[PDB]
DNA sequence: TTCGTGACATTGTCACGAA
DNA sequence: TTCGTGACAATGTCACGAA
DNA sequence: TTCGTGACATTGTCACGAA
DNA sequence: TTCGTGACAATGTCACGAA
């Protein structure tokens, strides 16, 4: 755990979680009835401006099989923040032709390495071609003259 | 255009659109007062089963701040469909590191070509360097052998 | 022929011929009996200083059987003389061991060319040893500084 | 001394010599006189076959101008004899041109080798060159097998 | 001094190719 | 046949170097 | 089990070169 | 205008190997 915790906002974060889903429709509560669950819908809706008070509610009305989906989504956004505190870590997304990907990826999984470097190497292996064209050609074209003189 | 329209469903999306955005907080409505605008929410949040009418709702009810944002976001949800059919047309998202991007994009910036052209051109040439190190490796292997 | 003839002088050495050979122990006359044969001898030595005389003498008197041996021994001196003049013209001999003679003499009957010339080449190519003794030592170094890069 | 000096023939040998130079025109007597010469001539010429005779014939009766001339010419014939046997020790002479002799004799007299040997050592080198140009044809050729 | 030895000069045939 | 020509043969010397 | 993290999926945007 | 389109932003999971 290289990224510290922030009880304050890190809690309000989870709050947004039980919202972004409840909106599109997804059993937030750990109950089955649409009577006991519906009730809980408001039991939290009011905790808007309510910090750590949010945690009090997890042990109360929080669907178990969600604890997984959440942790995974939390840590994620958790890293993005700290990583956004500068540039080198700030990641960016890219869209390219399918077939292209297939190669790349297939080259990442086959070239015992991760995408990143795999892209870093595929580059160095390119700019080197220029001086490798002649480097191999010179040692070959300069000797062609030995056949006679 | 390269793709044709589907009035029946096409408009369908927009619906799915105005709702969505609304669900998150937005005045899809062309009005303001918590009344008239309020009605136009339910008045539209119903054409679900008969979306072939949403269009006539957008032409004289939807907030104009979204006319463009839509024609775009839709025209996209359109291409995104037809390509999602086959495989060669499909697409894929990647998440590479900052540093890389610079150099990477940078190259694509100096050549101008597609950001994908970069992976082709880099694989195509950077792979031809993996070639001369082979013709220069099998050569230094049969050159010195005969010699000593 | 090629050279010239010395009517007077050449009869000179020509004379010494039957002479130096007669005292050696051989028949110069064509008379089996020691009466006419011995007569010719005495009559011969008297010509100690006569040219043309020796000519007619050889005719009626000398043994026309060794003639050939003479025409050969005489022709030689014709040549050994005009040649012995200038240096590059004078011929000279040497004693070589059999072993060595073999190869050499045997390279003449194969290559065809004269014995002398034979040595002329044997030498040139030989002396040229360094010329190609270096081409290798040299040409071969050009490949070493390459294979190791 | 390596050659067993067999007084038997070697003596008779001298004879032919004293006889030869005689038939040519040279004194074979220590006599300061003409006539006195007719003595040795026939006196010795009759020794057609005299061992110990012709021998002492010298210490007591023979020209002095030939004392060394003989001791040496004799050694020659002597060596020629034991040598006449096997061809691997006997010899032959050559008639070569002057100019050739020069270069030849030169290197020979120079390198500090015997005339005969000179040729031998010179032949080896005369072949190496003819051999070195060969390895050139193999290497020069094995370069285009692959290269051009 | 004697001797083994290498370098030539001499001088003589011998079998040949082009007058 | 006639010759210039080349390959060796044979035999004597000479100046050296080790005995 | 809790993390960090990398591989990707959806879906919204907007300048752009023709059409 | 209207399309097709490409570079990224936001962010929600999932199955990994070290803690």
UniProtKB/Swiss-Prot annotation, chains A, C:
Main localization of the protein described in the UniProt heading: cytoplasm
InterPro entries given in the database record: Arc_rbn_hlx_hlx, MatP, MatP_C, MatP_N, MatP_N_sf
One cellular component (GO) term of this entry: cytoplasm
Subcellular location: Cytoplasm
Disruption phenotype: Mutants grown in rich medium show severe defects in chromosome segregation and cell division.
UniProt GO BP: cell division; chromosome organization; chromosome segregation; protein homotetramerization; regulation of DNA-templated transcription
Gene Ontology MF term list: phospholipid binding; protein homodimerization activity; sequence-specific DNA binding
Hydrolase found in the keyword field: no
Keywords: Cell cycle, Cell division, Cytoplasm, DNA-binding
Matching HAMAP family: MatP (MF_01073)
Subunit note: Homodimer.
Its job: Required for spatial organization of the terminus region of the chromosome (Ter macrodomain) during the cell cycle. Prevents early segregation of duplicated Ter macrodomains during cell division. Binds specifically to matS, which is a 13 bp signature motif repeated within the Ter macrodomain.
Similarity comment text for this entry: Belongs to the MatP family.
Protein name per its UniProtKB record: Macrodomain Ter protein
Organism of origin: Escherichia coli (strain K12)
């Amino acid at each position: 755990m290289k990224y510290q915790q922030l009880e304050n906002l890190e809690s309000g974060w989870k709050w947004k979680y039980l919202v972004k889903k409840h909106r599109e429709g997804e059993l937030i509560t750990r109950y089955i009835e649409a009577s006991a669950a519906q009730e809980a819908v408001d039991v939290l809706l009011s905790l808007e401006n309510e910090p750590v008070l949010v945690n009090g509610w997890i042990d109360k009305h929080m669907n178990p099989e969600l604890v997984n989906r959440m942790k995974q989504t939390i840590r994620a956004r958790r890293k993005r923040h700290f990583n956004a505190e500068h540039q080198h870590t700030r990641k960016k997304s890219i869209d390219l032709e399918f077939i292209v990907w297939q190669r790349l990826a297939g080259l990442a999984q086959r070239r015992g390495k991760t995408l990143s470097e795999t892209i870093v190497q595929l580059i160095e292996d390119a700019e080197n071609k220029e001086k490798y064209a002649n480097k191999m050609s010179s040692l070959k074209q300069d000797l062609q003259a030995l056949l006679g003189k």
